């Protein structure tokens, strides 16, 4: 009840207090501050995916873990020296530091006052540094034990994991720590050991019983030593590296079969291979549709769709889907066969540009993709000026060395060939 009335949090609390229905349902002259109002305004800042920290109710008493409540009270008023003292006696410090960084980074965006905004942003960066400094000390002692800190569910902070807080708060220095990268790689290889390399994975992808031999890695040696080959095959096919490779091989075969059908098998009556690529693309868009409806946290369906449609490769995918459904109904009208052929040719180019998405998973190739995605912007604007320069000198060359001639495609295309040369 005694926040200083200049902070932004006090104004937001006043707004949510007056916007409540039950207090003017009780008495319009008496607004009453309850704790679930604070929980309701904290759920907005901290993100929709968490739970309300203080539940709505329906001698003395403590809540569970009061020190996080004192920390949250000290953070939102931007009191640095108090929060530095209070955090030193907290219980699960890493999740606390990440949640404080998320809160301050959210609060600094809508303050409309410069000095306090810069103070808040610097404080958020400082707490991210505290979280990194505790985690690397935890990581030096034990490897496999310290991985469990990134994935447990803390009931103190609304039942979220410690990784989602770092992912939402854009804490770039924490995610690139190196132990986290090792954890992500350990998830990526899945069941088997991480050091067998890529070519060995391709060969055992090619040969079924080579996995039953002694040419493959495993970890958790009860599966490595005791060979139950059905279970070994299930553990090998469950790993997402294998699923990624099988998906990219199926996509490559899809592209080659589509090129073969588009080259020679194009025909106004429906061939069976056209139905094959039709059901293939139907399966692809069925999986893409299934990926949107997954959200286990009750989040925004419009927010999920806005996140999907803001993506680059998702936009290219739906562009290819739109061009395919245009070219298919252009093909089914028998008088528009050649427009259907050229539209499906451009659709093939748009689907074959999708294969550049592979090298993002490479270690040393992803940054190059980011660099060329940056360079496109002034490549285009340079192309404009070179085009106007070249057409200028072309029309100058055609004007000086020829008389006035009204040839439509003789002299104009001759000068166009000269300028292109």
């Amino acid at each position: 009840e005694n926040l200083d009335p200049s902070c932004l949090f006090h104004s937001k609390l006043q707004k949510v207090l007056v916007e409540d229905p039950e207090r003017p349902a009780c008495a319009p002259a008496a607004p009453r501050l309850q704790m679930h109002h604070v929980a309701q305004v904290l759920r907005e800042l901290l993100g929709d995916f968490t739970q309300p920290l203080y539940p709505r109710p329906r001698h003395v008493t403590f809540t569970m873990d009061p020190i996080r409540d004192l920390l949250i009270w000290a953070i939102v008023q931007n009191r640095r020296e108090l929060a530095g003292i209070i955090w030193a006696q907290s219980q699960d410090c890493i999740a606390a530091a990440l949640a404080c960084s998320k809160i301050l980074k959210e609060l600094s965006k809508e303050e409309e006052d410069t000095d306090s905004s810069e103070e808040m942003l610097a404080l958020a960066e400082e707490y991210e540094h505290r979280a990194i400094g505790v985690f690397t000390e935890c990581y030096r002692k034990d490897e496999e034990r310290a991985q469990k800190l990134l994935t447990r569910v803390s009931e103190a902070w609304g039942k979220t994991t410690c990784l989602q807080l770092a992912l939402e708060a854009k804490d770039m220095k924490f995610v690139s720590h190196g132990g986290i990268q090792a954890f992500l790689t350990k998830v990526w290889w899945g069941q088997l050991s991480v050091d067998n390399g890529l070519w060995r994975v391709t060969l055992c992808m090619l040969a079924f019983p080579l996995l039953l031999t002694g040419l493959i890695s495993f970890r958790e040696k009860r599966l490595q030593d005791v060979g139950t080959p059905a279970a070994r095959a299930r553990a090998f096919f469950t790993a997402p590296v294998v699923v990624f490779h099988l998906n990219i091989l199926s996509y490559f075969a899809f592209l080659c079969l589509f090129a073969y059908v588009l080259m020679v098998d194009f025909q106004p009556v429906p061939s069976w291979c056209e139905c094959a690529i039709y059901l293939w693309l139907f399966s692809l868009v069925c999986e893409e549709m299934r990926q949107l409806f997954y959200d286990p946290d009750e989040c925004g369906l419009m927010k999920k769709a806005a996140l999907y449609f803001s993506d680059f490769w998702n936009k290219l995918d739906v562009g290819a889907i739109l061009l395919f459904v245009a070219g298919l109904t252009c093909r089914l009208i028998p008088a528009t066969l050649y427009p259907g052929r050229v539209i499906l040719s451009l659709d093939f180019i748009l689907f074959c540009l999708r294969l550049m998405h592979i090298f993002t998973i490479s270690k040393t190739l992803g940054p190059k993709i980011i660099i060329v995605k940056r360079m496109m912007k002034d490549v285009f604007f340079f192309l404009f000026l070179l085009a106007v320069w070249v057409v200028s000198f072309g029309v100058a060359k055609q004007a000086i060395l020829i008389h006035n001639e009204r040839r439509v495609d003789w002299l104009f295309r001759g000068a166009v060939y000269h300028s292109y040369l």
Partner: protein, 107 residues
């Protein structure tokens, strides 16, 4: 030369969702996937413990006490290293000579 210095941080940030999507994806290639789809539709008709799991309380207490101990050790190391900055040493040296100035002037 403008962006080549720190884009690896952006790539390391962008790695995670690509990991998580293929972790959540059913294990069939796109032609043979549909049966799994309708198998899931049977689950529609009638998360994972690898990225998110609830621990046991007797184990969680040991884990949290271990984290408490390591936090304490980190704070000791950070305070001791912040004592050894030379600017702080000069500031302490300047504060110490004022007591000698006052003690010599007062008597």
């Amino acid at each position: 030369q403008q962006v080549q210095e720190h884009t690896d941080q952006i790539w390391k940030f962008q790695r995670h969702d690509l990991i998580e999507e293929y972790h959540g994806r059913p294990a069939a290639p796109p032609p043979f996937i549909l049966l799994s789809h309708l198998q899931l539709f049977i689950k529609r008709v009638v998360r994972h413990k690898q990225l998110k799991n609830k621990l046991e309380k007797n184990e969680e207490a040991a884990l949290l006490s271990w984290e408490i101990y390591l936090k304490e050790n980190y704070l000791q190391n950070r305070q001791f290293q912040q004592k050894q900055r030379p600017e702080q040493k000069i500031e302490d040296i300047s504060n110490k000579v004022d007591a000698m100035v006052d003690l010599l002037d007062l008597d």
